Amino acid sequence: ASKRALVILAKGAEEMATVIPVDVMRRAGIKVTVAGLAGKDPVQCSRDVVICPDASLEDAKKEGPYDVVVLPGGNLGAQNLSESAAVKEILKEQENRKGLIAAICAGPTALLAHEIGFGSKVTTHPLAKDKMMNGGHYTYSENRVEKDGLILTSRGPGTSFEFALAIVEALNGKEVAAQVKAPLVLK
């Protein structure tokens, strides 16, 4: 029985911090749904890469629950995630069922917006620290990947492989993560 991931893709997402997790998760045999926040239409990412989602979030959310919900990076993408009632509901449900929530770069700021995982140790992109820490609802970490129970966070495009492999390890185990890692030619 394969694990399933929901990756929520909004306008202004950081395409590296989106594609790396999708691809690495699929290499691990996770069934990944790239769901467009705004619908099924193509999404213009932060550096103008245009990605066609697999489904609208509206449709994808009806096919839950998922073993992980992934919030990609991107400052404007995260702002869109933070403003979405649908995202709020998905994250609240996932938290309530004790399912993994993974967020990278500015992505974790949507956790703050939706009051998810307060009291957790988290990291973000350095430039998003102040936003994440407004109100002191989390404890901040400068680790490249941070995991506190079901809240898994990471810092930037350059930490995306580590972030993705941490998701794989959490879902499918250390051996699968190591097997997927080797052909990537990571340092």
Residues forming the site for its own copies (CB under 8 A):
14-16, 19-20, 22-23, 26-27, 34, 42, 46-52, 54, 125-127, 144, 155-159, 161, 183-187
Q: Is 137 a catalytic residue?
A: no
Task: Report d(CA 105, CA 20) in Å as an integer.
Answer: 13
Which one-letter DSSP state was computed for residue 35?
E
Query: Which residue out of 52, 114, 125, 137 is catalytically annotated?
Result: 125
In degrees, rounded to 5, the angle at the alpha carbon of residue 151 between the alpha carbons of residues 148 and 154 is: 90
Scan for tokens 């996932």, then name that residue. Answer: 94
Mask 143-162, x = binds Na ion (CB under 5 A)? ----------------x-xx
Scan for tokens 């399933």, then name that residue. Answer: 4
Q: Which residue, 22 or 100, has its beta carbon nearer to its own copies? A: 22
Q: Does 66 bind Na ion (CB under 5 A)?
A: no
Task: Pick what 169 binds: its own copies, Na ion, none; C-beta below 5 to 8 Å, kind-dependent.
Answer: none
Task: Report d(CA 98, CA 39) in Å as an integer.
Answer: 27
Q: Is 52 a catalytic residue?
A: no
Which whole-number Å values give the CA distances from 2 to 30, 133, 151, 168, in the listed order?
Answer: 6, 36, 21, 12
Instruction: State the number of binding residues for Na ion (CB under 5 A).
Output: 3
141 neighbors 123 (Cβ within 8 angstroms):
yes
Task: Report d(CA 36, CA 79) in Å as an integer.
Answer: 15
Mask 102-141, x = binds Na ion (CB under 5 A)? ----------------------------------------
Q: Which residue, 93 or 143, has its beta carbon nearer to its own copies? A: 143
Nearest residue (beta carbon) to Na ion: 161
Catalytic residues: 105, 125
Q: Which residues bind Na ion (CB under 5 A)?
A: 159, 161-162
